[PDB]
Amino acid sequence: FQSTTHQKLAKALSAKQKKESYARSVVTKEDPEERQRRLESQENERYRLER
Amino acid sequence: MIIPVRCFSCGKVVGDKWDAYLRLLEEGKQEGDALDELKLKRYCCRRMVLTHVDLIEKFLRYNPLEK
Amino acid sequence: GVKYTCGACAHNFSLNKSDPVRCKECGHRVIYKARTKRMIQFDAR
Amino acid sequence: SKPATLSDINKIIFGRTAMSKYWYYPEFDDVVKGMYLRLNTGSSPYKVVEVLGSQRIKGSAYGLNSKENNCDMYLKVAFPNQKEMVRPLFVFSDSSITHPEFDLFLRELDAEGLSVMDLRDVDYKYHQLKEMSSRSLSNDEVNSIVKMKQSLSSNTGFNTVLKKAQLQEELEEARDAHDHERVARIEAELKSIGAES
Amino acid sequence: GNKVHIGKVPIMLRSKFCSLRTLDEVDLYKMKECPYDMGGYFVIN
Ligand SMILES: [Zn+2]
Ligand SMILES: [Zn+2]
């Protein structure tokens, strides 16, 4: 156990699985559904124009 | 919530001794000795002061609803 | 005609059944009705 | 074209409490224009002044009725004999204008060579005040008034908690983005805002 | 090709993603939350 190689391996493997954070935070300033409704409105307008 | 005015069992007025009880406990007296100093002899009256929980102090930490 | 109170800043105002339900000054969406004026009596028992 | 009497002016009395109730209206600038109200001279004999307009002054927030009643609106008025003066809203008094006060105002108007407001214009002002007082605000107008008072808001516990929560959300966004420069500024700002009792 | 909103996930109270995680004792009182409340639940409707 007192060998430096074993201690470094144990430290590396212990701290390797400690770091786990995939999702990244963000700040929403407006309604998330605004893009959907505005693009639906534009699509309906161009559908009417195409018809 | 707040200290009862009367003892439930016999009706002795215990509602005027809460602050004195807290003072005596502050000075370092034991709870039994503090109750003895307040002249609460019957254990029915001692139960009222010994087991009271002061919940109004928690209720007062919320901001008032009318100003 | 009817008094209200804001749920956040405790401000008093009135509504005429046509304004949006909002606080005037801090814009909270939660308001409470004020206590009535009728006489209130209890039997102390 | 008829001269306005005392009762006609009394119909359009707009008190300081009413001013606090209606100063944040967008139309209040035109509503208060040309109105006659009792003013505290201070230097106190109360006198009547004519409102030449209003002008918002940022950074000049003042207590209107209570400590929390912060106001930025200022009224540009003018005595007839004296010159133009910019006064805050709380200087006006809720008490009605007395007979010697109105008589002195009329004498000052005659000395300057001016006339009194016409009865048709008095009725127009009265209808304007009644419409403004009985108006129902829209959602956008209410949000604009709330934003204006938030700009005027020096401090409020609920708003401080909301701002601290928003700053914490911005701080976690900066931390997750590995931005080591923004997070220090947000921490310093939180330290300045914090340390409550 | 950017961020597309795929839905809303209910948040468990007093968790790492809850607003009450940071608030200290005083702001918890200002937010009308009980300090004895422990979280671990969701608020749906
Ligand atoms: Zn007893
Ligand atoms: Zn409010």
Automatic annotation (TrEMBL), chain B:
Superkingdom, natural source: Eukaryota
Molecular-function GO terms, alphabetical: DNA binding; DNA-directed RNA polymerase activity; zinc ion binding
PANTHER family: DNA-DIRECTED RNA POLYMERASES I, II, AND III SUBUNIT RPABC5, DNA-DIRECTED RNA POLYMERASES I, II, AND III SUBUNIT RPABC5 FAMILY MEMBER
A single GO BP: transcription by RNA polymerase II
InterPro entries: RNA_pol_su_RPB10 (IPR023580), RNA_pol_suN_Zn-BS (IPR020789), RPABC5/Rpb10 (IPR000268)
Cellular compartments annotated: Nucleus
Classification via Pfam families: RNA_pol_N (PF01194)
Swiss-Prot/TrEMBL keywords: DNA-directed RNA polymerase, Metal-binding, Transcription, Zinc
One GO CC annotation: RNA polymerase I complex
Family, similarity comment: Belongs to the archaeal Rpo10/eukaryotic RPB10 RNA polymerase subunit family.
Amino acids binding Zn(2+): C7, C10, C44, C45
Protein name: DNA-directed RNA polymerases I, II, and III subunit RPABC5
From TrEMBL, chain C:
A biological process term (GO) from this entry: DNA-templated transcription
Localization per Swiss-Prot or TrEMBL: Nucleus
Positions contributing to Zn(2+) 2 binding: C23, C26
GO cellular component terms, A-Z: RNA polymerase I complex; RNA polymerase II, core complex; RNA polymerase III complex
The entry's keywords: Metal-binding, Nucleus, Zinc
Keyword check for Signal: no
GO molecular function: DNA binding; DNA-directed RNA polymerase activity; zinc ion binding
Residues bound to Zn(2+) 1: C6, C9, C23, E25, C26
Family listed: Belongs to the archaeal Rpo12/eukaryotic RPC10 RNA polymerase subunit family.
The name this protein goes by in its record: RNA polymerase subunit ABC10-alpha
Organism: Komagataella phaffii (strain ATCC 76273 / CBS 7435 / CECT 11047 / NRRL Y-11430 / Wegner 21-1) (Yeast)
UniProtKB/TrEMBL annotation, chain D:
Molecular function terms, GO-annotated: DNA binding
Domain of life of the source: Eukaryota
Plus3 domain ranges (all copies): 3-134
Protein name: RNAPII-associated chromatin remodeling Paf1 complex subunit
Designated gene of the protein: RTF1
Span of the entire protein shown here: 193 to 394 of 514
UniProtKB/TrEMBL annotation, chain E:
Reported function: DNA-dependent RNA polymerase catalyzes the transcription of DNA into RNA using the four ribonucleoside triphosphates as substrates.
Residues of the signal peptide: none
Source domain of life: Eukaryota
Assembly notes: Component of the RNA polymerase II (Pol II) complex consisting of 12 subunits.
Cellular localisation: Nucleus
Protein's UniProt name: DNA-directed RNA polymerase subunit beta
Family to which this protein belongs: Belongs to the RNA polymerase beta chain family.
